Design a protein around this ligand. Structure first.
Ligand SMILES: Cc1cc2nc3c(=O)[nH]c(=O)nc-3n(C[C@H](O)[C@H](O)[C@H](O)COP(=O)(O)OP(=O)(O)OC[C@H]3O[C@@H](n4cnc5c(N)ncnc54)[C@H](O)[C@@H]3O)c2cc1C
Ligand SMILES: CCCCCCCCCCCCO[C@@H]1O[C@H](CO)[C@@H](O[C@H]2O[C@H](CO)[C@@H](O)[C@H](O)[C@H]2O)[C@H](O)[C@H]1O
Length: 421
């Protein structure tokens, strides 16, 4: 309402959870902040691959949201938005109810676009998913069924995928956990299929020696690897793979039996957001400016996977650049600062900053991690590291993040630069 704006954050994930906290902190008691989200619980996404192999439980990485935000003055609706009317500024919930907003912050993350590949939905076939704790729990279940009836494994990333790290990570920890169970030997074949033009491309044209290190690792574990692949369909427990050359022309087609597989799907914008006329690109990604404001509606902001970022390269098989934790946080904090400025008179000049990708992967005792920035080469930072410290770092950041998501954040987040000062 007037002189008392109502700000809605849509999606309680890696961007939205902090965004609601930071928004309430910024706007104070004279403004209503509402967080709306499909599930009643927060989950630490980067931990899912480990749930997928049974190295972590749901309760280690997920918690009920309601108590933690409400004690901070935030309203929480554990309900999915089905429809967003940007003219009337009304959101229609699953249950029929309607919620009005003066400002809307979209943090809905990705739709997992299994529809791109018939058969590929985790509920339709043997190709599973580790993107959500629901899916990962399910992936682990099928993994036990593989352990009872050893059969070919296929792990990888589909065409259009943008988040490759986890595919590599999942392939290695499965290998690792097979070995530990002392049952690696029973596996007919272990294949890695990716839409990357080469191993370790990672949708960022490689970082450091990600190519040689990831290549040598898959080899070490006895995993055969194919690049430039699209999967045309999953069917009859078989994966139909088409492999192209640098020009798109086909150079072979395979038919891979799968007893247990996991392919990272392409990400699209969720439907309620994609369905807002004029809001999104053809993928369902919110077209926003440098201040995270939608280009069509001044009172709509967007942060996280939800936003549209232009491609810098066109790969033989379509691939996308990832949107990762640190940059998502800058998107969040900028959007908060820019709405507050609006509520207070000015255009917020705050931006996301320099594009960057930061990713950490834990293999058990040691980890791999990379930092790339900016998006185009030659970069200012281009580092791929492996070691125990990466593992210590992963473990530490999860603990930190889950804790912060419970106690709240003001709060220029990554003050993870006090370990210097
Ligand atoms: C398996 C995997 C591992 C990852 N590993 C890392 C990594 O190690 N490091 C890193 O920096 N990044 C990592 N990422 C990338 C990225 O940081 C995560 O995907 C992160 O969760 C993105 O946050 P987000 O806010 O954009 O979307 P999300 O975290 O997915 O949150 C979106 C939220 O919106 C909700 N939602 C969607 N539609 C609606 C609707 N209609 N109504 C209400 N709610 C809705 C969803 O339920 C969800 O709660 C990883 C990604 C994946 C999938
Ligand atoms: C974060 C997303 C990126 C992808 C996710 C993870 C994918 C899996 C990584 C596979 C790495 C396995 O291969 C591993 O690599 C490095 C090579 O530099 C080797 O490690 C080598 O360099 C490291 C330091 O960086 C030394 O500590 C080590 O003594 C040395 O042998 C390991 O002996 C080898 O076992």
């Amino acid at each position: 309402m007037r002189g008392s704006a109502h700000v809605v954050i849509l999606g309680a994930g890696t961007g939205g959870m902090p965004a609601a906290y930071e928004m309430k902190e910024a706007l104070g008691s004279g403004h209503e902040v509402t967080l709306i989200s499909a599930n009643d619980y927060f989950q630490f996404v980067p931990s899912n691959p480990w749930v997928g192999v049974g190295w972590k439980e749901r309760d280690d990485i997920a918690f009920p949201i309601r108590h933690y935000v409400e004690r901070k003055g935030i309203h929480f609706i554990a309900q999915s938005a089905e429809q967003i009317d940007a003219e009337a500024q009304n959101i229609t919930l699953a249950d029929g109810n309607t919620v009005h907003y003066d400002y809307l912050m979209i943090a809905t993350g990705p739709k997992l676009a299994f529809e791109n590949v018939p058969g590929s939905d985790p509920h339709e076939g043997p190709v599973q998913s580790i993107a959500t704790v629901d899916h990962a729990e399910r992936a682990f279940a099928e993994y036990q069924a593989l352990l009872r009836e050893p059969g070919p494994i296929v792990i990888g990333a589909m065409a259009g995928a943008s988040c490759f790290g986890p595919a590599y990570e999942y392939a290695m920890i499965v290998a690792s956990d097979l070995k530990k169970r002392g049952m690696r030997d029973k596996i007919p074949s272990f294949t890695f299929i990716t839409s990357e033009p080469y191993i370790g491309h990672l949708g960022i044209q490689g970082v450091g020696d990600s190519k040689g290190i990831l290549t040598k690792g898959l080899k070490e574990e006895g995993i055969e690897a194919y690049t430039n692949c699209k999967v045309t369909k999953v069917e009859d427990n078989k994966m139909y793979v088409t492999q192209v050359d640098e020009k798109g022309e086909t150079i072979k087609e395979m038919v891979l039996p799968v007893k247990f597989g996991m392919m990272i799907p392409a990400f699209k914008g969720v439907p309620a957001v994609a369905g807002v006329e004029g809001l999104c690109n053809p993928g369902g990604f919110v077209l926003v400016d440098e201040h995270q404001r939608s280009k069509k509606y001044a009172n709509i902001f967007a942060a996280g996977i939800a936003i549209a970022i232009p491609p810098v390269e066109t790969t033989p098989v379509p691939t996308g650049a990832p949107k990762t934790g640190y940059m998502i946080e800058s998107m969040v904090s900028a959007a908060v600062h820019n709405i507050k400025a609006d509520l207070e008179g000015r255009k917020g000049e705050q931006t996301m900053g320099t594009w960057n990708a930061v990713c950490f992967a834990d293999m058990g005792d040691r980890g791999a991690a990379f930092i790339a920035l900016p998006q185009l080469k030659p970069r200012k930072v281009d580092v791929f590291a492996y070691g125990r410290w990466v593992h210590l770092a992963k473990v530490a950041f999860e603990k930190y993040f889950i804790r912060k998501m419970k106690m709240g954040v003001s709060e220029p987040f990554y003050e993870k630069v006090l370990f210097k000062m």
